[PDB]
Symmetry: C2
Subunit: 62 residues, 2 copies
């Protein structure tokens, strides 16, 4: 119950405290697709939670 | 030497004060391509300066 929703496609190294670090192909569970084009999610590989630029991830087919 | 170096390909709405807002197709002059995958640049359309995620722009070969 509650599974992967997206996948990171680009390396994202945070510059800000609220951001989620991403490594290519990281499995993601996106909680919100904010209006300002930022995604709020959990990185299923690292377990960390944070935000990142929307275009850094693609949708995974349920 | 203030010629265009890149062009934004994705919409980027800042969440942090040091970021540079981007609209698809904005011509950019990237001053620094930082090691943490963030670009420091000048938006030639708005005249604003700031940083943004590297993968949000492509390099012009003109």
């Amino acid at each position: 119950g509650s599974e992967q929703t997206h996948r990171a496609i680009f390396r994202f190294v945070p510059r800000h405290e609220d951001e989620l670090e991403l490594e290519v192909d990281d499995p993601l569970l996106v909680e919100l697709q904010a209006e300002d084009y930022w995604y709020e999610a959990y990185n299923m590989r690292t377990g960390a939670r944070g935000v990142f630029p929307a275009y850094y991830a693609i949708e995974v087919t349920k």
